[PDB]
């Protein structure tokens, strides 16, 4: 069985393509073309979180919608207070090549990593008064691109070794390793129930994983190039992707195919960040042309543009209550938009 | 209008700002270098002369603190992390002169020097290094001397006139590596020939980064 397995592979791919074609009875803008396209919202800046001295590469909100962490290529990791623009902590990183950061749901730990191939977890609520690193997770052979806290004691990391992984923080070990990607994995998103997570990779494909069994459940194609950002719809039944081809897309798990493509002729710069709203109506997508296009999910209308930043927007995030949006760019500035 | 705990939070924030700007001022005074090469080249010799991801190297020479970001352990795609080095003072690129006739084993029969040339073309014309100078090291020149006689350069460069002198084939290699620069008047490439020794490569990088610093200061002042 040298090429018989390969031939079975193409026949199965064709069968999956036919099954996916069978599901699409009509396009999205044929059953959603009856509701009003609410938008035309500009969300002027309310806070400007200055203090960084290099490109901001990743930010993450807290579950209180009050504290947010930001990572920049200067060996700094700042917990802000978006309400009063205060700084709670300033962690000096051992490796300055940070391009992912996380905030634990309990608010006790902050994750960090990048081109050091190590995910570093910091304790914010020590009795000594200083923020110290708890454990340095090291099992990856490529750059870490995203880390999201499963719980207080579990993390999920995506690396540029065509591999995502799940760790036990206390033991600092590979609880389960998620393999199956062809190119580098660039983004993660954990479902609200914390049982599945999507991972978009440089192979122009995104897959759905089961955290417990440790195997892929669904695979998604459609993009022409690298997938940079990914995020879940609030229900956890859909997820949005963003590629370095100036195109966003929305996949739904049950249908197991794309539904809507967010693109325009005047946008040729790709995407670096994608986030959803509280109701998931707003697809806030940070594009490479120094602005964050506030898309509408149910339609493809570019509802708004957040044109504050004078350099490429690398990270944006929405509060748990949807009150604020915090975009971060290569200009060392964070802006809170409301 | 705000409470005493808010006042003390503001004071703590101001202290954090002062520490942050002090750290930034310290960082902006320290020169950054990116090392690239074909692995078989003298990257290891260069790093060992100065003293599973980025092996970042620190050394101090004539009151300039140096950082050398030795990537190369990354088997991933350079396109997805090369922009993080946008802003290095200079790029150190090492190519082995003893590669034109050394085993054509890049993928399976590809000449090593051709691989180094396409790597140099990729780095030089990259859009993140439009104004980033390149310090090209043409290493293993001794093996070049005792291998020109055994084998001609026509195997790698058939267009060569056949002049198999030491200081004509090396000059030809240097010329072919310069010619890949598609945008002059915005970038200078500093090639280097002293010896297989110390005390000169470090000084060469020091001179190149001093020239880059002067150019950066002129551009900051607006004259150039």
């Amino acid at each position, epitope marked *: 069985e040298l090429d018989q397995l390969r031939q079975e592979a193409e026949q199965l791919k064709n069968q999956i393509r036919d099954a996916r074609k069978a599901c699409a009875d009509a396009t999205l803008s044929q059953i959603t073309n009856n509701i009003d396209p609410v938008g035309r919202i500009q969300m002027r800046t309310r806070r400007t979180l200055r203090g960084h001295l290099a490109k901001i590469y990743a930010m993450h909100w807290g579950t209180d919608s009050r*504290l947010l962490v930001s990572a920049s290529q200067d060996g700094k990791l700042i917990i802000w*207070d978006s309400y009063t623009t205060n700084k709670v902590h300033a962690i000096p990183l051992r490796s300055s090549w940070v391009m992912t950061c996380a905030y634990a749901p309990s608010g006790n730990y902050v994750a960090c990593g990048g081109l050091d191939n190590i995910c570093s977890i910091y304790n914010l609520k020590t*009795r*000594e*008064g200083n923020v110290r690193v708890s454990r340095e997770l090291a099992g990856h052979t490529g750059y870490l691109s995203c880390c999201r806290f499963l719980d207080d004691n579990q993390i999920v990391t995506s690396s540029g070794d065509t591999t995502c992984a799940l760790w036990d923080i206390e033991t600092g070990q590979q609880t389960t390793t998620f393999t199956g990607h062809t190119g580098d994995v660039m983004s993660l998103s954990l479902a609200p129930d914390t049982r599945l997570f999507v991972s978009g990779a440089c192979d122009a494909s995104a897959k759905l994983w089961d955290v417990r069994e440790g195997m892929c459940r669904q695979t998604f194609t459609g993009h022409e190039s690298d997938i940079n950002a990914i995020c879940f719809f609030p229900n956890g039944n859909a997820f949005a992707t963003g590629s370095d081809d100036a195109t966003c897309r929305l996949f739904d798990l049950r249908a197991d195919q794309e539904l809507m493509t967010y693109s325009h002729d005047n946008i040729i710069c790709g995407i670096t960040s994608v986030s959803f709203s509280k109701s998931g109506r707003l697809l806030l997508a940070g594009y490479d042309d120094f602005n964050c296009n506030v898309w509408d999910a149910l339609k493809a209308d570019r509802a708004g543009v957040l044109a504050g930043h004078d350099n490429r927007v690398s990270c944006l995030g929405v509060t748990d209550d949807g009150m604020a949006v915090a975009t971060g760019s290569w200009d060392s500035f964070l802006k809170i938009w409301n | 209008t705000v409470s005493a*705990e808010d006042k*003390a939070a503001a004071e703590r924030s101001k202290m954090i700002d002062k520490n942050l700007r002090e750290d930034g001022e310290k960082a902006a005074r320290e020169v950054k270098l990116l090392l690239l090469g074909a692995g078989e080249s003298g990257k290891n010799t260069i790093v060992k002369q100065m003293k599973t991801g980025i092996v970042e190297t620190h050394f101090t020479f004539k009151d300039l603190h140096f950082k050398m970001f030795d990537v190369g352990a990354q088997r991933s795609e350079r396109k997805k992390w090369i922009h993080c080095f946008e802003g290095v003072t200079a790029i150190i690129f090492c190519v082995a002169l003893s590669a034109y006739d050394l085993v054509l084993a890049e993928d399976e029969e590809m000449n090593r020097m051709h691989a180094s040339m396409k790597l140099f073309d990729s780095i030089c014309n990259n859009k993140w290094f439009t104004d980033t100078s390149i310090i090209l090291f043409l290493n293993k020149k001794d093996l070049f001397e005792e291998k020109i006689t055994h084998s001609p350069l026509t195997i790698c460069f058939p267009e060569y006139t056949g002049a198999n002198k030491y200081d004509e084939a090396a000059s030809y290699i240097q010329s072919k590596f310069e010619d890949l620069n598609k945008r002059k008047d915005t970038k200078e490439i500093y090639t280097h020939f002293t010896c297989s020794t110390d005390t000169k490569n470090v000084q060469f990088v020091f001179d190149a980064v001093t020239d880059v610093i002067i150019k950066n200061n002129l551009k900051d002042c607006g004259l150039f």
Partner: single-chain antibody
Amino acid sequence: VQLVESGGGLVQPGGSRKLSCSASGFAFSSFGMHWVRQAPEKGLEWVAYISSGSGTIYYADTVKGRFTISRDDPKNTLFLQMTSLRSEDTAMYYCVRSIYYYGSSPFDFWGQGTTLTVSDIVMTQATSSVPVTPGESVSISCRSSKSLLHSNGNTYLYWFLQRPGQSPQLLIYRMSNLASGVPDRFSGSGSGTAFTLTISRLEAEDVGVYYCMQHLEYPLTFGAGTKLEL
């Protein structure tokens, strides 16, 4: 974490002494420091305050012009130089650390104590003592003069317990927020002016004197002190 403090003793009237507090366990360089004294029979009263990166120093009106507070972070020591010691300065002085970042727990750790023998929102704890029995729910009430609530949602009232031969320890930093090593059988509930503490079950360590301290601005007046007895 420990804050051991030395100095103090038989000082002649109209004299001067310096109290020294040494910090070892924690990062003293990033914490504010409060000095809180307590007369041998009377309750607690705030006597000084210094902040991290000393720019804000606050004194009580009782000892404002003749006391001073000094800290030297490299040796992690807190100092208090007092001058013209009037007789009303006989008290047991405590060192308490604090930090004021968002969601911090100020007045969390207290010191051992130093004896001294020399020869504003009003906090009222009307009930001086209560006969309490094992395994019953008890509640302590504290009354204020000005509203302790602030426009930012906070309510600056602090609850402490002073065991018979022990230093005070924080139970409730805000009006409703517990502390690190405190059992979850303590609870706090207040209003604009009225404030109450609740204990679900009395234990063998809960006997002591309970105090309430305001932190609206900086007078930091403590209350009279409710003393549970079994």
